[PDB]
Amino acid sequence: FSPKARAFSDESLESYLLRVVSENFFDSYEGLSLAIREELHELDFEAHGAFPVDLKRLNVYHAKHNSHFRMRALGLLETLLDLPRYELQKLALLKSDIKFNSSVALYNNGVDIPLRFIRHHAEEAVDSIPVCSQCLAEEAYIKQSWHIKWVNACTKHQCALLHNCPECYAPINYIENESITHCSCGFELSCASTSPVNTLSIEHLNKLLDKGERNDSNPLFNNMTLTERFAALLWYQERYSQTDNFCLNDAVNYFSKWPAVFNTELDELSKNAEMKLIDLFNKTEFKFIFGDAILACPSTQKQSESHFIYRALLDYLVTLVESNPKTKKPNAADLLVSVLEAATLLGTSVEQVYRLYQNGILQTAFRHKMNQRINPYKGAFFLRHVIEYKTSFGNDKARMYL
């Protein structure tokens, strides 16, 4: 068997493989699967043991324990089905170490995504990968952009994506049905009609999936790369508990007024800091008053390029110690900060901030007695001199020059 159909720029692995079995040498994907299972079993038993029979768990990120064997199976698949080398490996949704604040991520060509934002992940009992109908009319394949939960309408055809069958009102899932063009319910006629657009919502989402250069009024769609544009959305959700909400228009209107909304949120926490006090300022932790607002912030592990959320948070803390001078009465600038919250404010590794503690550069705030190794979550250092250490290092957009 030799499939002559070739992969598109943004076609998914399941889409291409279903378009391979769309050629009438095999009746269904299962027939092909059992046939390649046999040919792998005759070749290599490990790659045979790796290769799953179903189309469900064929993506690389599903296999936690046999990823190396999965690539070996995929590579033998390329070798066996008369395809060029890497042909299946470019469509794969590969693994990623980078954590979106204790959220495992997923790598597509140049772009790493949080695994919450994927539609086809974990296999929810009944879910829909939504379909642009008159996009299938031109060519019958599934783009990788439709698997992202934020994408609801895009883009050349300017039409809302189709979720459910026009006959049964059963959700459209091309992985479950093993059919790109047709529904299990029928789809006897051509592609169905659509609700058009809000019309200005498309230039929001087209600004999102633009790659890695150009500025505008909205800080979200400013000079950023796509991977950090998702980081801002994930931060927004868990702040206001919008975990199940995936409306793009509820984020871009919020982030349009960015600096004013976050300052006033942080201003009331400073004014009502003395109210909440069970102990003194120099004994209370930072998360007791402000709550999670440092360790939730998107990380600056990339390049040493700071996030626009991170630039806005810290620049508030710089003016906090400015307004709270160092007197004998403790104030809001004596709040205790942990090594992880300290690591984020310096924008370095946690071992590097322990090494500053090792050479007594950053001075804890009480003495551990000889067998005390610092608990990474217990508030160790003051907010005060952790900032002054950061103002000892100069970067371009400090308030000193203007």
Partner 1 sequence: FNSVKIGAALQSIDDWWDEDASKRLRVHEFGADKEIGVARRPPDSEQNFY
| Interface ranges with a copy of itself (CB under 8 A) | 44, 47, 60, 63-65, 67-72, 85-86, 89-90, 92, 94-97, 107-110, 301-305, 322, 326, 348, 351, 355, 358-361, 385-386, 388-389, 391-396, 399-401
Q: How near is the Cβ of 222 to partner 1 at its closest, in Å?
A: 37
The Cα 2–Cα 79 span in angstroms is 11
Q: Among a copy of itself, partner 1, none, what binds residue 86 when CB lies within 5 to 8 Å by partner kind?
A: a copy of itself
Counting Cα atoms < 13 Å in the Cβ hemisphere of 134 gives 13
Of the pair 86, 240, the CB lying nearest a copy of itself is at: 86
CA distance 7 to 16: 6
Provide, rounded to whole angstroms, the least separation between the CB of residue 382 and a copy of itself.
Answer: 10
Residue 297: CB minimum distance to a copy of itself, A: 18
Residue with tokens 């086809």: 120
- Of the candidates 18, 101, 106, the residue with the CA atom closest to the CA atom of residue 67: 106
Cβ distance to a copy of itself smaller for residue 195 or 359: 359
Q: Is the separation of the CB atoms in 7 and 91 below 8 Å?
A: yes
Select the binding partner of residue 122 from partner 1, a copy of itself, none (C-beta < 5 to 8 A, by kind).
partner 1
Terminal Cα-to-Cα distance of the chain (whole angstroms): 69
Q: Mask: binding to partner 1, 47-76, rule CB under 8 A, as x and -? A: --x-------x----xxxxx----------
Residue 351 lies near partner 1 (rule: CB under 8 A): no
Q: Residue 176 is encoded by which pair of tokens?
A: 């479950």
Q: Are 248 and 208 in contact (CB under 8 A)?
A: yes
Asked if 367 interacts with partner 1 (CB under 8 A), we say: yes
Separation between Cα atoms, residue 208 and residue 154, nearest integer Å: 12
**Residues 380, 365: Cα–Cα separation, whole Å:** 6
The beta-carbon contacts of 33-37 under 8 Å, at least 24 apart in sequence, are 36/77, 36/80, 36/81
Q: Is 119 in the site for partner 1 (CB under 8 A)?
A: no
CB-nearer residue toward a copy of itself: 156 or 328: 328
Among 146, 13, 147, 133, smallest CA distance to 83 is for 13
Out of partner 1, a copy of itself, none, what residue 101 binds, judged by CB under 5 to 8 A for its kind, is none
Q: Using CB under 8 A, which of 109, 245, 263, 363 touches partner 1?
A: 363
Minimum CB distance to a copy of itself, residue 96 (Å): 7
Rounded to a whole number of angstroms, the minimum distance from the CB of residue 31 to partner 1 is 24
Query: Any residues with CB less than 8 A from the CB of 281 and at least 6 apart, and which?
Result: 273, 330, 331, 332, 334, 335
Q: Which of the choices a copy of itself, partner 1, none does residue 304 contact, using the CB cut-off of 5 to 8 A by kind?
A: a copy of itself
Q: In what order do the strands lie in the sheet with 111-114?
A: 94-99, 104-108, 111-114
Q: Under rule CB under 8 A, how many of the chain's residues touch partner 1? A: 13
Judged by the rule CB under 8 A, the positions of this chain that interact with partner 1 are: 49, 57, 62-66, 122, 358-360, 363, 367
